[PDB]
Amino acid sequence: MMYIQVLGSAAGGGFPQWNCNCVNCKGYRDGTLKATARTQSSIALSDDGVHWILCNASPDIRAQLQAFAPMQPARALRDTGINAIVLLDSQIDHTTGLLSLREGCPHQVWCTDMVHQDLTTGFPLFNMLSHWNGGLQWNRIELEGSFVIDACPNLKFTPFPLRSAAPPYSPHRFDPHPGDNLGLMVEDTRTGGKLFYAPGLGQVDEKLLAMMHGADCLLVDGTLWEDDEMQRRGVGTRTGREMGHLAQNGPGGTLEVLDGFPRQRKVLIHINNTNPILDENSPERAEVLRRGVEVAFDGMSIELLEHH
Amino acid sequence: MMYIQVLGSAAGGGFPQWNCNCVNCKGYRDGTLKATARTQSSIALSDDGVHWILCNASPDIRAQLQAFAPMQPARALRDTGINAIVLLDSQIDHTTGLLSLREGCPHQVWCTDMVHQDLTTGFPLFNMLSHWNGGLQWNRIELEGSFVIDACPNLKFTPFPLRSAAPPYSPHRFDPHPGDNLGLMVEDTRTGGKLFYAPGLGQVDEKLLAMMHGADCLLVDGTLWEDDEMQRRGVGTRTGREMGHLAQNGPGGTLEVLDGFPRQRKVLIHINNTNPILDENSPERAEVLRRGVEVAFDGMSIELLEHH
Ligand SMILES: [Cu+2]
Ligand SMILES: [Cu+2]
Ligand code: NA
Ligand code: NA
Ligand SMILES: [Zn+2]
Ligand SMILES: [Zn+2]
């Protein structure tokens, strides 16, 4: 059994987003829209329900941990259910939460060389946190092969490269490198059950589709319904392609892609505040359910039991 | 009229604290303790109820803004009630929230030279956020005199120096300098109403008592009931004096000090998770109320109407 807990299911900014009055955010605040608030994307993984691996440390981490009881096993006066953190990139929304964990150092943190470079230079979290009881202990994610985190010895992680886009603060922002961005395959080696996790997914190719067909659960980028969603809502000018996100709708969209995977469990995660699928009464939401695709929500638990 | 809104009333870590199973934190989670959760210390000030100055940007800022409706005036598709941020020190718990505001840059940020040095070097928030539409626009807090923020032109800020203790990540951690730590006097120049704000207060002297006697509301360090509180709860070894905090109880404690100020409104803020005053049924809480001292809570509104 692999336990996957959705701590946060929104894209950057969360839902509602602090400075946003789009249709969804304003409708949420007014009480006129049927929607549920979401913190910034992060999931926790376990092979036993007791030891957890956090994937991305969001700025909402305090509330996220507080809402999931196994994050506080209360085995001692100080304790936590977090046994390691895996980072998929060096973006502020995926790393800031580490600052809120500093009173529990040392923490084992798995990330690529490129992400470690960003996090020792432009956003020097490793340097800062070194001053708190040993700080973050870096474990290198290599750009080939797999890794196993000892706290959950039955989970085998095999990252896969995604298109590189170092964050705006990065010393190599204008020189993308392999290792800037990864998705994860995670296998419970007791059962062969496999999660394909790609909360940021801007393109699909043959290689990727092959990997997905081997998985049991697809937990994938649900950021925007349309490539120009930000512009349509009037709250931004960047396009899905500009942000590395394949929209759900249209030719080559993720719904078209997911049509190829009838057997797999399919869940959209990392959903932007603008995305109509957040409106529980929308026709876009209705269409996702018709297609057998689920929309992740904070607190969602996914049990991956066996391989198909 | 000066409006003071308590966005967060806890000390670092909040209440409950993510990794803490002390009497209070565990009692809160178990449902056996009558206490209310608190985010990390931050207040917002206004002379008009519409334009706000944030004092410290906590890591809980997203939830804090969401809970206080005037932070989202909805005057445009993107908007915020934050018109400036004042920082009293460079500590992680008082600055991290700026990262969550980057999609709303530029922001006017007031802080001392020493805090700007820390925030361009050891925790380089100004450098990072420069890449988001102009980033943070630094306004220097001088170590003498007063300042006025144009968005709230009737509020006159006069900082006062406190004992210097740069944070553990600071390049000058072992060489404290004037400007590392400040408290604030804030006056509504329309009425003469004065707030004395010292959420971190490790020592009192004659000069400080004189300033306090001129104020109408004292909003002061409520971190620990006893100097060795961390040790008594078994969740730490640092003492109040080691953290720059005067405890409430005992000789020279803040309650003894506050006994000298019968006329002023008196409110404890920045309360640690360990502090018995968080337990609404505790005798420590009962004693604070007997003394006419209030315990701040998230959402508390204070109206400072007039000078005594
Ligand atoms: Cu994100
Ligand atoms: Cu604090
Ligand atoms: Na399994
Ligand atoms: Na006033
Ligand atoms: Zn919105
Ligand atoms: Zn506690």
Side-chain angles (χ1 to χ4, degrees):
Chain A
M1 182 62 70
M2 185 193 313
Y3 300 98
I4 302 146
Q5 186 66 20
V6 179
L7 301 178
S9 51
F15 172 63
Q17 175 170 310
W18 70 281
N19 68 335
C20 188
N21 301 115
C22 74
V23 158
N24 282 347
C25 288
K26 182 178 180 180
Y28 176 82
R29 298 194 194 88
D30 286 346
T32 56
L33 188 94
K34 196 199 191 170
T36 306
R38 293 170 157 77
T39 57
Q40 289 163 282
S41 65
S42 177
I43 64 172
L45 300 172
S46 183
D47 60 354
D48 70 358
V50 174
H51 300 95
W52 295 86
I53 300 164
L54 180 65
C55 292
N56 296 337
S58 100
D60 292 297
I61 190 167
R62 181 171 172 269
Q64 290 170 330
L65 300 180
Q66 192 179 315
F68 187 49
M71 293 292 171
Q72 185 44 267
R75 295 168 292 201
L77 281 165
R78 298 218 161 186
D79 199 8
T80 184
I82 300 169
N83 284 276
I85 297 113
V86 172
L87 304 174
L88 297 191
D89 57 59
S90 65
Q91 292 166 31
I92 291 167
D93 295 341
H94 302 151
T95 58
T96 292
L98 294 167
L99 296 164
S100 290
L101 306 178
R102 65 190 183 286
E103 295 288 333
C105 289
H107 298 287
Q108 297 304 311
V109 178
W110 289 76
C111 64
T112 63
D113 183 64
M114 287 297 116
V115 166
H116 183 251
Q117 289 193 35
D118 278 348
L119 296 180
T120 50
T121 60
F123 184 13
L125 291 175
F126 278 83
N127 304 352
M128 291 170 60
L129 295 177
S130 69
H131 301 277
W132 278 261
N133 201 43
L136 300 181
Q137 307 304 333
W138 180 40
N139 290 262
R140 182 187 307 110
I141 298 177
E142 303 294 348
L143 303 183
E144 73 185 327
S146 300
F147 64 90
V148 172
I149 293 176
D150 284 344
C152 295
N154 305 105
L155 301 185
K156 177 173 161 183
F157 290 79
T158 308
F160 52 89
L162 295 174
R163 184 181 175 81
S164 304
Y169 72 79
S170 175
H172 68 271
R173 180 201 182 176
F174 295 154
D175 189 15
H177 292 309
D180 282 334
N181 305 77
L182 302 170
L184 296 171
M185 188 79 74
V186 192
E187 181 185 354
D188 179 343
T189 50
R190 297 166 296 191
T191 67
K194 278 183 179 177
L195 170 65
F196 174 90
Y197 186 50
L201 187 56
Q203 49 198 48
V204 169
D205 60 22
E206 283 303 317
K207 205 166 178 184
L208 198 71
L209 288 167
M211 292 177 72
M212 292 163 69
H213 271 294
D216 296 288
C217 185
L218 308 180
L219 189 45
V220 299
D221 193 328
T223 311
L224 313 173
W225 183 254
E226 299 285 7
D227 182 64
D228 64 344
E229 179 164 290
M230 298 295 286
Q231 292 108 288
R232 295 171 185 231
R233 306 303 213 175
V235 293
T237 51
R238 282 161 309 149
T239 73
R241 300 287 199 170
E242 263 189 37
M243 302 188 275
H245 300 295
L246 197 51
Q248 279 98 70
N249 201 30
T254 52
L255 294 180
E256 192 176 276
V257 171
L258 289 175
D259 201 49
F261 301 86
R263 194 156 181 121
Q264 280 77 10
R265 188 170 184 179
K266 294 167 286 283
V267 183
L268 300 172
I269 193 163
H270 194 266
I271 303 146
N272 207 44
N273 67 90
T274 54
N275 187 330
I277 68 180
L278 295 178
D279 171 3
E280 293 169 16
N281 296 128
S282 76
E284 290 83 6
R285 181 79 160 237
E287 172 177 347
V288 175
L289 309 181
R290 273 203 297 284
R291 295 181 162 259
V293 175
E294 296 168 74
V295 182
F297 52 94
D298 290 10
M300 180 184 194
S301 303
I302 295 165
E303 290 184 343
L304 206 176
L305 162 88
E306 68 190 10
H307 185 59
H308 58 290
Chain B
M1 182 62 70
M2 185 193 313
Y3 300 98
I4 302 146
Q5 186 66 20
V6 179
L7 301 178
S9 51
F15 172 63
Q17 175 170 310
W18 70 281
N19 68 335
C20 188
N21 301 115
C22 74
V23 158
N24 282 347
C25 288
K26 182 178 180 180
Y28 176 82
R29 298 194 194 88
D30 286 346
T32 56
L33 188 94
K34 196 199 191 170
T36 306
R38 293 170 157 77
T39 57
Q40 289 163 282
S41 65
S42 177
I43 64 172
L45 300 172
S46 183
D47 60 354
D48 70 358
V50 174
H51 300 95
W52 295 86
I53 300 164
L54 180 65
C55 292
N56 296 337
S58 100
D60 292 297
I61 190 167
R62 181 171 172 269
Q64 290 170 330
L65 300 180
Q66 192 179 315
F68 187 49
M71 293 292 171
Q72 185 44 267
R75 295 168 292 201
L77 281 165
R78 298 218 161 186
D79 199 8
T80 184
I82 300 169
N83 284 276
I85 297 113
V86 172
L87 304 174
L88 297 191
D89 57 59
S90 65
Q91 292 166 31
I92 291 167
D93 295 341
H94 302 151
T95 58
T96 292
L98 294 167
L99 296 164
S100 290
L101 306 178
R102 65 190 183 286
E103 295 288 333
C105 289
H107 298 287
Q108 297 304 311
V109 178
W110 289 76
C111 64
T112 63
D113 183 64
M114 287 297 116
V115 166
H116 183 251
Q117 289 193 35
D118 278 348
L119 296 180
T120 50
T121 60
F123 184 13
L125 291 175
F126 278 83
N127 304 352
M128 291 170 60
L129 295 177
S130 69
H131 301 277
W132 278 261
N133 201 43
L136 300 181
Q137 307 304 333
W138 180 40
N139 290 262
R140 182 187 307 110
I141 298 177
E142 303 294 348
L143 303 183
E144 73 185 327
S146 300
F147 64 90
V148 172
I149 293 176
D150 284 344
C152 295
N154 305 105
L155 301 185
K156 177 173 161 183
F157 290 79
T158 308
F160 52 89
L162 295 174
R163 184 181 175 81
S164 304
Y169 72 79
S170 175
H172 68 271
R173 180 201 182 176
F174 295 154
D175 189 15
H177 292 309
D180 282 334
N181 305 77
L182 302 170
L184 296 171
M185 188 79 74
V186 192
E187 181 185 354
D188 179 343
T189 50
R190 297 166 296 191
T191 67
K194 278 183 179 177
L195 170 65
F196 174 90
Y197 186 50
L201 187 56
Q203 49 198 48
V204 169
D205 60 22
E206 283 303 317
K207 205 166 178 184
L208 198 71
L209 288 167
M211 292 177 72
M212 292 163 69
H213 271 294
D216 296 288
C217 185
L218 308 180
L219 189 45
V220 299
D221 193 328
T223 311
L224 313 173
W225 183 254
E226 299 285 7
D227 182 64
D228 64 344
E229 179 164 290
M230 298 295 286
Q231 292 108 288
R232 295 171 185 231
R233 306 303 213 175
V235 293
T237 51
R238 282 161 309 149
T239 73
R241 300 287 199 170
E242 263 189 37
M243 302 188 275
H245 300 295
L246 197 51
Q248 279 98 70
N249 201 30
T254 52
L255 294 180
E256 192 176 276
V257 171
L258 289 175
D259 201 49
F261 301 86
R263 194 156 181 121
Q264 280 77 10
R265 188 170 184 179
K266 294 167 286 283
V267 183
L268 300 172
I269 193 163
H270 194 266
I271 303 146
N272 207 44
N273 67 90
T274 54
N275 187 330
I277 68 180
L278 295 178
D279 171 3
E280 293 169 16
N281 296 128
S282 76
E284 290 83 6
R285 181 79 160 237
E287 172 177 347
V288 175
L289 309 181
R290 273 203 297 284
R291 295 181 162 259
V293 175
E294 296 168 74
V295 182
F297 52 94
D298 290 10
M300 180 184 194
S301 303
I302 295 165
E303 290 184 343
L304 206 176
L305 162 88
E306 68 190 10
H307 185 59
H308 58 290

